[PDB]
Write an enzyme that holds these catalytic residues in place. Structure first.
Site, PDB file in Angstrom:
ATOM      1  N   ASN A 166       0.819  -1.184   0.000  1.00  0.00           N
ATOM      2  CA  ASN A 166       0.000   0.000   0.000  1.00  0.00           C
ATOM      3  C   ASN A 166       0.848   1.226   0.000  1.00  0.00           C
ATOM      4  OD1 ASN A 166      -3.043   0.577   0.498  1.00  0.00           O
ATOM      5  ND2 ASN A 166      -1.903   2.155   1.691  1.00  0.00           N
ATOM      6  N   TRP A 167       0.399   2.242  -0.747  1.00  0.00           N
ATOM      7  CA  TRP A 167       0.946   3.600  -0.769  1.00  0.00           C
ATOM      8  C   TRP A 167      -0.149   4.562  -0.297  1.00  0.00           C
ATOM      9  CZ3 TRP A 167       3.390   4.035  -6.359  1.00  0.00           C
ATOM     10  CH2 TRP A 167       4.583   3.247  -6.415  1.00  0.00           C
ATOM     11  N   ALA A 170      -0.264   9.710   5.208  1.00  0.00           N
ATOM     12  CA  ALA A 170      -0.693   9.875   6.623  1.00  0.00           C
ATOM     13  C   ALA A 170       0.347  10.773   7.264  1.00  0.00           C
ATOM     14  CB  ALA A 170      -0.813   8.534   7.355  1.00  0.00           C
ATOM     15  N   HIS A 189      -5.638   2.029   5.247  1.00  0.00           N
ATOM     16  CA  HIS A 189      -4.865   0.853   4.865  1.00  0.00           C
ATOM     17  C   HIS A 189      -3.571   0.724   5.617  1.00  0.00           C
ATOM     18  CE1 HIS A 189      -7.314   0.384   0.977  1.00  0.00           C
ATOM     19  NE2 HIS A 189      -7.957  -0.134   2.039  1.00  0.00           N
ATOM     20  N   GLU A 280      -5.443  21.130  11.158  1.00  0.00           N
ATOM     21  CA  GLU A 280      -5.991  20.085  10.322  1.00  0.00           C
ATOM     22  C   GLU A 280      -6.943  20.618   9.252  1.00  0.00           C
ATOM     23  OE1 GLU A 280      -7.892  17.527  13.290  1.00  0.00           O
ATOM     24  OE2 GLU A 280      -5.968  16.439  13.687  1.00  0.00           O
ATOM     25  N   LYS A 389     -15.333   2.120   3.679  1.00  0.00           N
ATOM     26  CA  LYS A 389     -14.215   2.964   3.903  1.00  0.00           C
ATOM     27  C   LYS A 389     -14.222   4.230   3.025  1.00  0.00           C
ATOM     28  CE  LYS A 389      -9.126   2.868   3.630  1.00  0.00           C
ATOM     29  NZ  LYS A 389      -9.115   3.542   2.275  1.00  0.00           N
TER      30      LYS A 389
HETATM   31  C1  LIG Z   1      -3.836  14.575   0.668  1.00  0.00           C
HETATM   32  C2  LIG Z   1      -3.633  14.287   2.153  1.00  0.00           C
HETATM   33  C3  LIG Z   1      -4.226  13.110   2.652  1.00  0.00           C
HETATM   34  C4  LIG Z   1      -4.205  12.840   4.038  1.00  0.00           C
HETATM   35  C5  LIG Z   1      -3.540  13.693   4.883  1.00  0.00           C
HETATM   36  C6  LIG Z   1      -2.851  14.886   4.442  1.00  0.00           C
HETATM   37  C7  LIG Z   1      -2.922  15.145   3.000  1.00  0.00           C
HETATM   38  C8  LIG Z   1      -2.255  16.316   2.346  1.00  0.00           C
HETATM   39  C9  LIG Z   1      -2.113  15.652   5.543  1.00  0.00           C
HETATM   40  C10 LIG Z   1      -0.898  14.852   5.850  1.00  0.00           C
HETATM   41  C11 LIG Z   1      -1.714  17.054   5.172  1.00  0.00           C
HETATM   42  C12 LIG Z   1      -3.080  15.751   6.650  1.00  0.00           C
HETATM   43  C13 LIG Z   1      -3.440  14.419   7.259  1.00  0.00           C
HETATM   44  C14 LIG Z   1      -4.640  14.608   8.057  1.00  0.00           C
HETATM   45  O1  LIG Z   1      -4.521  15.067   9.253  1.00  0.00           O
HETATM   46  C15 LIG Z   1      -5.968  14.455   7.621  1.00  0.00           C
HETATM   47  C16 LIG Z   1      -6.607  13.103   7.811  1.00  0.00           C
HETATM   48  C17 LIG Z   1      -7.438  12.545   6.875  1.00  0.00           C
HETATM   49  C18 LIG Z   1      -8.017  11.210   7.072  1.00  0.00           C
HETATM   50  C19 LIG Z   1      -7.639  10.567   8.224  1.00  0.00           C
HETATM   51  C20 LIG Z   1      -6.840  11.094   9.164  1.00  0.00           C
HETATM   52  C21 LIG Z   1      -6.300  12.349   8.949  1.00  0.00           C
HETATM   53  N1  LIG Z   1      -3.531  13.409   6.302  1.00  0.00           N
HETATM   54  C22 LIG Z   1      -3.821  12.084   6.642  1.00  0.00           C
HETATM   55  C23 LIG Z   1      -4.558  11.261   5.800  1.00  0.00           C
HETATM   56  N2  LIG Z   1      -4.982  10.031   6.126  1.00  0.00           N
HETATM   57  C24 LIG Z   1      -4.626   9.562   7.311  1.00  0.00           C
HETATM   58  O2  LIG Z   1      -4.984   8.336   7.652  1.00  0.00           O
HETATM   59  N3  LIG Z   1      -3.891  10.260   8.152  1.00  0.00           N
HETATM   60  C25 LIG Z   1      -3.424  11.570   7.880  1.00  0.00           C
HETATM   61  O3  LIG Z   1      -2.694  12.103   8.722  1.00  0.00           O
HETATM   62  N4  LIG Z   1      -4.846  11.698   4.571  1.00  0.00           N
HETATM   63  C26 LIG Z   1      -5.826  11.013   3.814  1.00  0.00           C
HETATM   64  C27 LIG Z   1      -5.464   9.672   3.146  1.00  0.00           C
HETATM   65  O4  LIG Z   1      -4.316   9.857   2.309  1.00  0.00           O
HETATM   66  C28 LIG Z   1      -6.563   9.047   2.315  1.00  0.00           C
HETATM   67  O5  LIG Z   1      -7.641   8.740   3.224  1.00  0.00           O
HETATM   68  C29 LIG Z   1      -6.109   7.798   1.543  1.00  0.00           C
HETATM   69  O6  LIG Z   1      -7.306   7.188   1.015  1.00  0.00           O
HETATM   70  C30 LIG Z   1      -5.353   6.811   2.410  1.00  0.00           C
HETATM   71  O7  LIG Z   1      -4.870   5.710   1.569  1.00  0.00           O
HETATM   72  P1  LIG Z   1      -5.432   4.230   1.740  1.00  0.00           P
HETATM   73  O8  LIG Z   1      -5.503   3.908   3.234  1.00  0.00           O
HETATM   74  O9  LIG Z   1      -6.818   4.235   1.079  1.00  0.00           O
HETATM   75  O10 LIG Z   1      -4.440   3.429   0.972  1.00  0.00           O
HETATM   76  K   LIG Z   2      -4.257   5.146  -1.297  1.00  0.00           K
HETATM   77 MN   LIG Z   3      -4.712   1.652  -0.306  1.00  0.00          MN
END
Ligand SMILES: Cc1cc2c3c(c1C)C(C)(C)C[C@@H](C(=O)Cc1ccccc1)N3c1c([nH]c(=O)[nH]c1=O)N2C[C@H](O)[C@H](O)[C@H](O)COP(=O)(O)O
Ligand SMILES: [K+]
Ligand SMILES: [Mn+2]
Ligand SMILES: Cc1cc2c3c(c1C)C(C)(C)C[C@@H](C(=O)Cc1ccccc1)N3c1c([nH]c(=O)[nH]c1=O)N2C[C@H](O)[C@H](O)[C@H](O)COP(=O)(O)O
Ligand SMILES: [K+]
Ligand SMILES: [K+]
Ligand SMILES: [K+]
Ligand SMILES: [Mn+2]
Lengths: 497, 497
Positions: A166-167, A170, A189, A280, A389
């Protein structure tokens, strides 16, 4: 060279060529200043900042690119940064971007190609030679609980059985010289894979974090493609090309050959450390709100000459956490609905909702053939989306008919406000996973992790039966074609702008 | 001259002087063309159109001014038309405008002055000399059920006992040569007074309809000032001047001396006729949706030389039905809350809600001293507002804390979307009067006239207890003052706009 969508260094070039880049060659402080400039850029849809002279940069680590996936000012190329991640024309619509990101969903994967070396191997630092506290890691918001090195890199983890790599994005912050802490939360993931290693119980998770990856890869990293699907092969199918990867030095994971910066190490199955708070995506920080997060150990750094670290200065509108998280979730929701035989043509997370809503455009001809009701249809839609999800981050679904462009927030707001009767035309969902980052969840009156979701039906009654029974009281719909054209043709003659 | 706020002809002059008027001196058709141009103006915040050469104008009846209370393009004078109704600088804020409209609420009335004649007497047509079907009355929307002569004039009716004379806007269309039909619905004051005459049972209601009245009067006509309060004396106190009125010729009502056009006659206590459909403030028309409305008999017309009829081409954003109905209702709601000891500082109806919401800014220091909870406070607020006529048109109240500017819709949307948990943080009101014009009411799934209201609490938990516990993740709040100022001072030097 390499195409912009396949090589971050080339992407930076492309933004320059586009007149979408400001190179700042004088000293800029990673303690707040870089992020403040980037914040202002994001709030005003200005050009992306490239900080070439970062205070604390040493031996090539590092420059910073802010706002890599944020909006441009003009309507004509509003989404041009995103288009530049994907080899699309800069004038691409959101529909086009989301269709490109969905395209690989009914294609065979194109697995990656292993090559012996690449630019990411130009320099290295072993575990006697680096200290993460000595790098120019930014303080992004004044009340952040750490320096968030990781806002736009790609975590790489693989299932114990080797069958899924997975890529994903987070966040993570520096803990000490050789560790990070970060979010690893369900149902993501990285968390699912971490749980597999924890149940096996034998070792920490082999891990890498690659910054400045191929732009097409960072987009898939931000999208909730299905469980078990290796992002590299999805990106390969989307782009029509196998991605070139090199093996890590200290483990057997594989990173993009042109990555700017790579950390190699382990994600612990046992250890935690303080993480957060962080400013956030919903627009807030809660100072002092630190909690235990996952803990990563870094054993090796490799990097390009003159490495560039991308950074998201996230918060209030508009940045990558809106343009990518919201839109890519909405794309996956559109597909999930269609695969569940629901008559949804389009989906988008309005920016005005802080990407907490998704508007779903309904093919009302198909709806009419279902011979259903609002109560039944709302429940079906909400069950599909909120139990999956892909629906995790979304707390309100707004159903709209065919007249509404869901990519236009003013039109979604109009439909929601005028076609959905509060209470009666809604179904609340309390027994679904909630998104704790929304302030009304994690800092609210109820359970942080459960409920707080709603389906709001902005379909009018006759859209389920006989068809739309109104015309809009607007210039477009309230006047005949020949009159409209006359008024337009005489507009500036008469005296108007 | 006579001041602009006291004389419609002078108001027209003022818009010209302001470079806020386009005079169209070539022939324009009242059948759709005038309204189409006005619609386009309202959708683009262009200059107000003055149609000096209306096809069908005869013997002085009439020219048309469209968009009299609509928005200007620039942010600096966005509300300048409204300011020009009130003698305020054109750069006046919405707060200033609403405070001016509330100012007379704790002043003694200044009753009107009766004068022997005025410009409205320059011409007359008795009941052998006019035919309403022969005047250039506009067809405003292509599917309208009549030609709506009355979109921006002032109905004048008086209680049987003589003690209350009400001025209000309510629509009306031409029925035949000497009659109109229109809306006369509860809880509106024209309806309340009509019911008094109907219970007396002896005669039809003496009535006048004055078009092109003093702008300060048309603003009060659009505001839900209290039951029993004569608008003329409220306007007199607001402006500091007694309004000059002349007696009608055929009844004993009194009209503004400078009215452009006056109809004199009766509102029937027995007769009805077909009314509507009409393209309405929420942005829709339902073709063929005709219902019985009140019926007016016209006995006499008097008018100024070169009379000008104001017209609202209402519908989708932004026109008088948004800028005046919504904002003036919100002003009265603010006052009503404060008079009920509720800690509300500001109120506004966001345009993005199609003026169906009002955002209420809370003085949270006062709230904390109440030692209350969300459930209790929402119910108290909703009971006060939704049980009162001032709340009639409003279906959602959004409570926000002191950091939110309720006059900025983006900030209201942010707070609603991030601070109000759907369901849990809301209280639904089904046993209150509903506004049937909203499509989800009158054309929806439930009772047209009851319920469908909600109080949505976007106050965070600690705003009731100890104080706000966050900072915004924005440029303003996430960076220290000296850094912000540095970034601003170096912005254009660095390369940004
Ligand atoms: C574009 C972006 C995306 C995220 C995040 C940030 C940015 C710029 C930052 C790092 C700036 C902010 C941060 C967040 O604080 C926001 C957030 C979003 C969702 C869940 C938790 C935090 N974050 C992040 C995120 N996913 C998280 O699991 N913790 C994260 O820390 N995401 C979202 C995450 O990439 C997507 O949900 C993908 O679907 C995950 O991939 P799979 O699990 O499906 O393979
Ligand atoms: K992904
Ligand atoms: Mn994935
Ligand atoms: C600025 C404006 C205002 C109205 C209306 C329009 C415009 C431009 C037109 C004519 C364009 C549209 C029309 C509407 O269709 C909208 C509407 C609004 C509220 C009730 C019914 C209809 N209308 C109107 C309206 N009040 C109505 O009782 N039927 C009306 O016909 N109003 C609202 C009304 O003036 C306010 O509620 C006042 O408080 C009434 O005065 P009091 O009863 O308090 O003395
Ligand atoms: K509905
Ligand atoms: K009134
Ligand atoms: K709340
Ligand atoms: Mn009144």
């Amino acid at each position: 060279a390499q195409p912009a969508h396949l090589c971050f260094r080339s992407f930076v070039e492309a933004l320059k060529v586009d007149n979408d880049l400001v190179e700042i060659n004088t000293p800029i402080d990673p303690n707040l200043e870089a992020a403040a400039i980037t914040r202002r850029v994001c709030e005003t849809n200005d050009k992306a900042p490239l900080f070439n002279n970062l205070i604390g940069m040493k031996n090539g680590l590092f420059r910073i690119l802010g706002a890599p996936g944020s909006l441009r000012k003009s309507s004509a190329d509003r989404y041009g940064r995103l288009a530049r991640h994907l080899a699309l024309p800069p004038t691409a619509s959101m529909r086009e971007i989301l269709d490109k990101m969905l395209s690989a969903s009914d294609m065979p994967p194109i697995p990656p190609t292993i090559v012996p070396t690449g630019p990411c191997k130009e320099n290295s630092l072993d575990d006697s030679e680096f200290d993460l506290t000595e790098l120019p890691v930014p303080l992004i918001h004044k009340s952040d609980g750490g320096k968030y090195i990781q806002t736009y890199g790609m975590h790489i983890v693989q299932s114990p059985d080797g069958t899924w790599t997975n890529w994903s994005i987070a966040r993570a912050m520096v803990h000490d010289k050789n560790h990070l802490t970060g979010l690893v939360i369900p149902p993501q993931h990285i968390w699912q894979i971490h749980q597999m290693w924890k149940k096996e119980g034998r070792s920490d998770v082999p891990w890498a974090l690659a910054f400045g990856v191929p732009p097409a890869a960072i987009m898939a990293s931000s999208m909730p493609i299905p469980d078990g699907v290796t992002e590299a092969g999805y990106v390969g199918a989307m782009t029509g090309s196998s991605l070139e990867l090199v093996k890590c030095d200290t483990n057997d994971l594989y990173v993009p050959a042109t990555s700017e910066i790579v950390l190699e190490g382990t994600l612990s199955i046992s250890e935690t450390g303080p993480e957060g708070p962080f400013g956030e995506m919903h627009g807030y920080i809660f100072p002092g709100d630190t909690h235990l997060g996952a803990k990563y150990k870094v054993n090796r750094i490799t990097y390009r000459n003159n490495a560039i670290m991308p950074m998201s200065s996230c918060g209030r509108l508009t940045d990558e956490t809106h343009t990518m998280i919201g839109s890519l979730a909405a794309a996956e929701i559109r597909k999930l609905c269609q695969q569940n035989d629901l008559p949804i043509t389009d989906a988008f997370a309005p920016f005005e909702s802080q990407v907490t809503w998704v508007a779903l455009r309904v093919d009302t001809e198909k709806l009419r053939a279902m011979k259903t009701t609002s109560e039944g249809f709302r429940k079906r839609v909400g069950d599909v989306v909120f139990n999956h999800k892909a629906g995790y981050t979304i707390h309100r679904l707004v159903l709209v008919g065919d007249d509404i462009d869901v990519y236009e927030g003013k039109d979604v707001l109009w439909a929601f406000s005028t076609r959905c009767r509060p209470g009666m035309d809604e179904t609340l969902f309390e027994d679904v996973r909630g998104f704790p980052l929304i302030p009304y969840m994690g800092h609210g009156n109820g359970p942080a992790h459960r409920g707080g979701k709603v389906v709001s039906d902005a379909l009018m009654p006759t859209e389920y039966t006989t068809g739309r029974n109104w015309e809009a009281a607007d210039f477009n719909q309230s006047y005949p074609e020949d009159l409209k054209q006359k008024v337009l043709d005489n507009w500036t003659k008469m005296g108007f702008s």
